[PDB]
From a paper:
Aggregation-prone-motifs (APRs) of proteins are short segments, which – as isolated peptides - form diverse amyloid-like crystals.
To study the potential interference of TFA, we have lyophilized the peptide in HCl, and crystallized it again from 10 v/v% ethanol. Interestingly, crystals grown at 37 °C (in the absence of TFA) consisted of parallel β-sheets. The hydrophobic residues (Leu1, Ile3, Trp5) form clusters in both structures, while hydrogen bonds are formed by chain termini, solvent molecules, Tyr2, Gln4 and Trp5 of chain A in the class 4 structure. The geometric parameters characterising this interaction are similar in the two structures: the distance between the centres of the aromatic rings are 5.6 Å and 6.1 Å in the class 1 and class 4 structures, respectively, while the angle between the planes of the rings are 81.9° and 86.7°.
Numbering used by the authors:
A (entry chain A), B (entry chain A), C (entry chain A), D (entry chain A), E (entry chain A), F (entry chain B), ...: 1 to 6
Write the structure that this text describes.
């Protein structure tokens, strides 16, 4: 699981 | 699962 | 599952 | 599943 | 399943 | 671009 | 770009 | 870019 | 970039 | 960048 959130 | 969210 | 959301 | 959403 | 939505 | 090979 | 190989 | 190999 | 190898 | 090898 990879989450990139901005 | 890959989530890229901006 | 790949989600790209802007 | 691939979702590209803008 | 591929969804491209703008 | 979405590539699925079975 | 999403690549899935089975 | 998401790469999954089985 | 996410790389998963099985 | 996330790399997972099995």
């Amino acid at each position: 699981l990879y989450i990139q959130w901005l």
